[PDB]
Structure 1
Amino acid sequence: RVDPLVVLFLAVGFIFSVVALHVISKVAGKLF
């Protein structure tokens, strides 16, 4: 029992999580 907006929220949240992992990797590499 899932609504469409739930699927869209999951997809955008996952894209956000991947880009966030990339950016935290970059800032950790540049900082130290």
Structure 2
Amino acid sequence: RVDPLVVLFLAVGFIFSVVALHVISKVAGKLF
């Protein structure tokens, strides 16, 4: 069903979301 580059994009965007969520938490802890 799923192309392999779609799997690669899903994984990289997933890990990017996990990083950016910690970054949002750290910036919100530093500012507020």
TM-score (norm 1): 0.93
Identity %: 100
Q: Which runs of 5+ in 1 are unaligned?
A: none
Number of equivalenced pairs: 32
Task: Please give the per-residue CA displacement for 1:1-32, whole angstroms capped at 9, x wherever unaligned.
Answer: 11000000000010000000000000000001
- Runs of 4+ aligned residues of structure 1 deviating over 2 Å after TM superposition are none
TM-score (norm 2): 0.93
CA RMSD of superposed structures (Å) = 0.4
Q: Which runs of 5+ in 2 are unaligned?
A: none
